[PDB]
Ligand binder design. Structure first.
Ligand SMILES: Nc1ncnc2c1ncn2[C@@H]1O[C@H](COP(=O)(O)OP(=O)(O)OP(O)(O)=S)[C@@H](O)[C@H]1O
Length: 216
């Protein structure tokens, strides 16, 4: 599991801390949902568990980890190269991810069927396509922990439903992966195991759905 006791850090060598008093356990085989307002330290905490920000005074333990950032980035390469991401190409695995990410029709819509040269930063692509490709790259890798920082921001309602059902609750949950998602919706809270309520860079409530509905 991913354990954190006493989160304390900031985006400066010295200054007022935006991470303060964070203690979270993320057990294996769990869909951990993080929710909060705009500016509650959701992404900051997501990077804190990744080892990206060395905390000042605190302990954090959990290793290679897949991650899909809020802003999608690509490579000046093909789409298959983006999704495989230096991984041995598979027939059933790659096609399963392609179908489970609602990308095959949009990929066939490109001027080249596949192996299309994605432009610099993705000029010949839109935001939804880039975010879908990023989630596909995060899903295709054979790892344990998978962080997804708001992958439903540039997607439709049907696209989000299909992605969470086929990929999250039936493909990530299939292999029993530690999936930590940061989004703000309601169709995902009953599907999760641990809800994390963030406010002003601090965890206000922590526990399960029944442990949250039975508290203030
Ligand atoms: N890379 C960075 N460098 C400097 N400051 C940052 C960086 N990322 C975040 N911050 C600061 O951290 C504060 C909170 O950022 P976030 O945790 O990302 O907000 P959030 O609402 O919890 O999550 P979002 O908005 O869905 S990414 C912001 O006011 C930023 O100024």
């Amino acid at each position: 599991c991913v354990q954190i006791i006493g989160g304390f850090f900031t985006w400066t060598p010295d200054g007022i801390p935006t991470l303060s008093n964070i203690t979270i356990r993320i057990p294996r085989g769990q869909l951990t949902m993080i929710v909060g307002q705009v500016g509650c330290g959701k992404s900051s905490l997501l990077l804190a568990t990744l080892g990206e920000m060395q905390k000042v005074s605190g302990a954090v333990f959990w290793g290679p980890v897949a991650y899909a950032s809020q802003k999608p980035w690509l490579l000046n390469a093909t789409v298959e190269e983006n999704i495989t991401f230096e991984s041995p190409f598979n027939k059933q695995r790659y096609k399963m991810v392609i179908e489970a990410c609602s990308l095959q029709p949009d990929i066939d819509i490109l001027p080249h069927g596949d192996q299309t040269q994605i432009g610099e930063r993705g000029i010949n692509l839109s935001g939804g396509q880039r975010q879908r490709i990023s989630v596909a790259r995060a899903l295709y890798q054979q790892t344990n922990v998978v962080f997804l920082d708001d992958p439903f921001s540039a997607l439709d309602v049907h696209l989000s439903d299909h992605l969470m059902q086929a990929g999250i609750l039936e493909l990530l949950r299939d292999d029993k992966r530690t999936v930590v998602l940061v989004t703000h919706k309601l169709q995902y809270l009953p599907h999760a195991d641990w809800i994390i309520a963030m406010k002003d860079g601090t965890i206000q409530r922590e526990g399960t759905l029944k442990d949250f509905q039975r508290s203030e």
